Amino acid sequence: SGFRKMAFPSGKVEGCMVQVTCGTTTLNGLWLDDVVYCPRHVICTSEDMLNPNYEDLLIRKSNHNFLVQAGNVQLRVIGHSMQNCVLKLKVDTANPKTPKYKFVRIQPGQTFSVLACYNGSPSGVYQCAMRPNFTIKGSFLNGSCGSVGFNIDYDCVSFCYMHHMELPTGVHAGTDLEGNFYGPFVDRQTAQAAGTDTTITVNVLAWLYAAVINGDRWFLNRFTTTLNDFNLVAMKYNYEPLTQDHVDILGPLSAQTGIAVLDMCASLKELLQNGMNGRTILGSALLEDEFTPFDVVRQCNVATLQ
Amino acid sequence: SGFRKMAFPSGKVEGCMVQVTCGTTTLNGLWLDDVVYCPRHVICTSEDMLNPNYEDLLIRKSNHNFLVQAGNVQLRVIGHSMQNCVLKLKVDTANPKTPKYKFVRIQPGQTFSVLACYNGSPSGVYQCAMRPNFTIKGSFLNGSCGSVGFNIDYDCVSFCYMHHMELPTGVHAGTDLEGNFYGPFVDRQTAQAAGTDTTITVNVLAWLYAAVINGDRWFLNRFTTTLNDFNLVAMKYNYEPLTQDHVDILGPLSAQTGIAVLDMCASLKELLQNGMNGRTILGSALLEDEFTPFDVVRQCNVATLQ
Ligand code: NA
């Protein structure tokens, strides 16, 4: 029993974290086989960051300008190139601790584990969801750039996020490992215009099912609604529309509890309209939206048949 | 910026987790040097669990009754002994991945990372706090026994918790790595109600300081309180007493913000008497008590002088 925000065990990723220094800037990089991946703004001076000509800045650099440290050992850089906002440093040594891995681009609403690093050294691990406005609500200090987000899918590490920036509102922005930003953001010091954030409805419903599986049932009502009526109410509360695909992926949880998805929607509608009665659900006084249906299935052992 | 429940990176502990099987019971063990530590109730049948005499149960066991698997590799058991509620299995091979480590017994209010494991395989990682009633509000399923809690001090893993049991209320209980339970609990199927859980006041104050450092200030007021008048209020709401030692450990945060501890206590007194009136603090609608003063110092970069 119990329900907690849980991250993947981070060991396979820890063995890939290195420190990258260029000039006086130090941040983290990801060493997979004979390539280190890191944010390209490691090459910028303060002046460059106001209006960076990255293509010209990278040409001006030489391999000897990149200091790559893997624990106590310096790795020799023997080539460099750029893919969108990620710098790729070729090193003369392949990482023997490279895990089976893939680079994936996640969708809003999806969750992943963040390995926060400083000075090439892993510091903490926490679960995050990609917000509908493509930001993440993380905890990061200076030196965290290059920290990565990932999921473990069977025997493979699926890297989905590289940290690049904190917006002035205190939320975070980054790229996939092909160097493309999530959201309309750029790696420079300039106005960055995040969309209004919204609540991830399918995840809230998943978490209400987790509550029921754990015996927290007070908020259930016997009513059921239509998908269209639910969406009319929920969008007044800045919730994302619920789609038939969302209904379908909640199916394992509706099966386990015997509570139809549109019956749970009517329970959520009443919570939004009338509030949480001064009560908690799974230890929270607010509706939680950073747990996906699969996060709930895995933590509650829902997928067994007996 | 940001404030998140964060666990330590788990890799140093992942390298120590093994599977231990006795009869048809399988659970997890912790392999350090040439010893594997696990809950002693791995030797019990269903009948035994109702009323075990562990010394007598262990006399009839031989080294060959213990199957220890590290990956797809069996470890030869060459001795077995019991220390309080932990079984120690001597194996013929020292774990080459043993980190620097120590065994510590933590206090209520203290936080630690849990590496939840199944079949000797790490599954997820999360932060939790020891409750004043010596229970932990964890997330554990059948097969999690043997999972461990820990803190890291740069290079040293301080092991503080081994998981043994879920009470019928859904909370968890376990031992330190010397086998002594936290709290009045026993490794037997028998009634064992936990004491009343109370709120960890010093941690709530630390979290209010985290909020101020992150820009949430709406709850600060011009009221003042003595320590005793604060405790007279807090105890009415099942908060632990705040002592002068707690006031001192909040020193770094009262220094960073310029807000005296007793002035923050006056803010807490008003929140307790009146609620938050439709507001949130650091994204929560309740007063959070599972972050220690040092958790706040570390995420909020408080321990620098410039
Ligand atoms: Na309903």
Based on its alpha-carbon atoms, the radius of gyration of chain B, rounded to whole angstroms, reads 22
Q: For residue B20, how many other CB atoms are within 10 A of its CB? A: 27
* Sheet arrangement for strand A17-22: A73-75, A66-70, A17-22, A25-32, A35-39, A86-91, A77-83
Phi, psi of B150, rounded to the nearest 5 degrees? -160, 160
Between the CA of A290 and the centroid of ligand 1 the distance, in Å, is 22
Rounded CA separation A103/A180 (Å): 12
- The number of CA neighbours under 13 Å toward the Cβ of A185 is 28
How would you list the strands of the sheet with B25-32, edge to edge? B73-75, B66-70, B17-22, B25-32, B35-39, B86-91, B77-83
- A214 vs B: CB within 8 A: yes
Instruction: Assign 3-class secondary structure to chain B.
Output: CCCCCCECCCHHHHCCEEEEEECCEEEEEEEECCEEEEEHHHHCCHHHHHCCCHHHHHHCCCHHHEEEEECCEEECEEEEEEECCEEEEEECCCCCCCCEEEECCCCCCCEEEEEEEECCEEEEEEEEECCCCCCECCCCCCCCCCCEEEEEECCEEEEEEEEEEECCCCCEEEECCCCCECCCCCCCCCCCCCCCCCECHHHHHHHHHHHHHCCCCCCCCCCCCCHHHHHHHHHHHCECCCCHHHHHHCHHHHHHHCCCHHHHHHHHHHHHHHCCCCCCECCECCCCCCCCHHHHHHHCCCCCCC
B130's tokens = 């020891």
Residues B2, A140: C-beta atoms closer than 8 Å? yes
Measure CA of the first residue to CA of the last residue in chain A; give whole Å: 17
Token pair of B14 as six digits: 């992942």
- The closest alpha carbon to B199, from B247, B235, B249, B230, belongs to B235
Q: Under an 8 A CB cutoff, do A9 and B4 touch?
A: no
A210 Cα–ligand 1 center, Å? 15
With beta carbons less than 8 A apart as the criterion, state whether B291 and B111 touch: yes
CA distance B62 to B86: 16
According to DSSP H, which parts of chain A are helical?
Answer: 11-14, 46-50, 54-60, 201-213, 227-236, 244-249, 251-257, 261-274, 293-299
Cα(A128) to centroid(ligand 1), Å: 29
Distance from CA of B63 to the nearest CA of A (A): 31
From residue A184, give the alpha-carbon distance in Å to each of A137, A173, A174, A187, A239. Answer: 16, 10, 11, 11, 21
**Distances from the Cα of A53 to the Cα of A49, A92, A165, B75, angstroms:** 9, 28, 18, 58
- Rounded to the nearest whole angstrom, what is the distance from the C-alpha of residue B140 to the centroid of ligand 1? 28
Q: How was this entry determined? A: X-ray
Question: What is the distance between the alpha carbons of residues B47 and B44, in angstroms, rounded to a whole number?
Answer: 8
Q: How far apart are CA B118 and CA B104, in angstroms?
A: 24
**Count of other CB atoms within 10 angstroms of residue A127:** 24
B95: nearest Cα among B127, B119, B120: B120
At A26 the three-state DSSP class reads strand
- Residue A157 bridge partners (DSSP): A101, A152
**A142/A120 Cα distance (integer angstroms):** 13
| Closest-CA distance of chain A to residue B152, Å | 10
Question: Which CATH number describes the domain made up of B201-299?
Answer: 1.10.1840.10
Decide if B171 contacts B161 (C-beta within 8 A). no
What are the structure tokens assigned to A273, written together? Answer: 């309209």
CB B138 within 8 A of CB B132: no
Mutation pick from B72, B112, B114, B139 vs chain A, by most beta carbons of A within 10 Å, is: B139
Contact B20, B89 (CB under 8 A): yes
Say if the Cβ atoms of B125 and A125 lie within 8 Å: yes
Report the distance separating Cα A20 and Cα A69, nearest Å: 7
Residues B11 and A14 sit within 8 Å (Cβ to Cβ): yes
What end-to-end distance do the CA atoms of chain B give, in Å?
A: 17
Which SS3 state, helix, strand or coil, does residue A255 take? helix
Q: In sequence order, what E strands does chain A have?
A: 17-22, 25-32, 35-39, 66-70, 73-75, 77-83, 86-91, 101-103, 111-118, 121-129, 148-153, 156-166, 172-175
Whether B6 sits inside 8 A of A139 (CB atoms) is: yes
Domain ranges of chain A: 15-91, 201-299
Q: Are strands B100-103 and B156-166 parallel, antiparallel or unpaired?
A: parallel
3-class SS at A50?
helix
Q: Which DSSP letter does residue A51 get?
A: S
Pick from B153, B105, B165: nearest CA to B130:
B105
Radius of gyration of the CA atoms of chain A, in A: 22
Residue B264, class by beta-carbon neighbours within 10 Å (0-12 exposed, 13-18 middle, 19+ buried)?
buried
Test A7 with B126 for CB contact under 8 angstroms. yes
Chain B (261-300) residues lying within 8 Å, Cβ to Cβ, of chain A: 275, 280, 283-286, 299
C-alpha closest to that of A30 among A224, A220, A160:
A160
- HSE at residue B133, side-chain half, CA atoms within 13 A, is 17
The Cα angle at residue B72 between residues B13 and B158, in degrees rounded to 5: 10
Q: What are the structure tokens assigned to A185, written together?
A: 């953001």
Q: Does domain B11-175 have CATH number 3.40.50.2300?
A: no
| Cβ-contact B161, B148 below 8 angstroms | yes
Q: Are A106 and A130 in contact (CB under 8 A)?
A: yes
Please report the sign of the dihedral spanned by the C-alpha atoms of residue A98, residue A99, residue A100, residue A106: negative
Question: Are A137 and A192 in contact, with CB atoms under 8 Å apart?
Answer: no
Contact between residue A104 and residue A131 where contact means Cβ atoms under 8 Å apart: no
Task: Please give the CATH architecture assigned to the domain spanning A15-91.
Answer: Beta Barrel (2.40)
Report helix, strand or coil for A197: coil
User: Encoding tokens for residue A233?
Assistant: 């109410």
| DSSP class of A40 | G
Does A103 lie at the interface with B, CB-CB under 8 angstroms?
no
CB A139 within 8 A of CB A116: yes
**DSSP helix/strand/coil, A93:** coil
Cα–Cα distance between B171 and B146 in angstroms, integer?
16
Does B115 contact A284 at a Cβ distance shorter than 8 Å? no
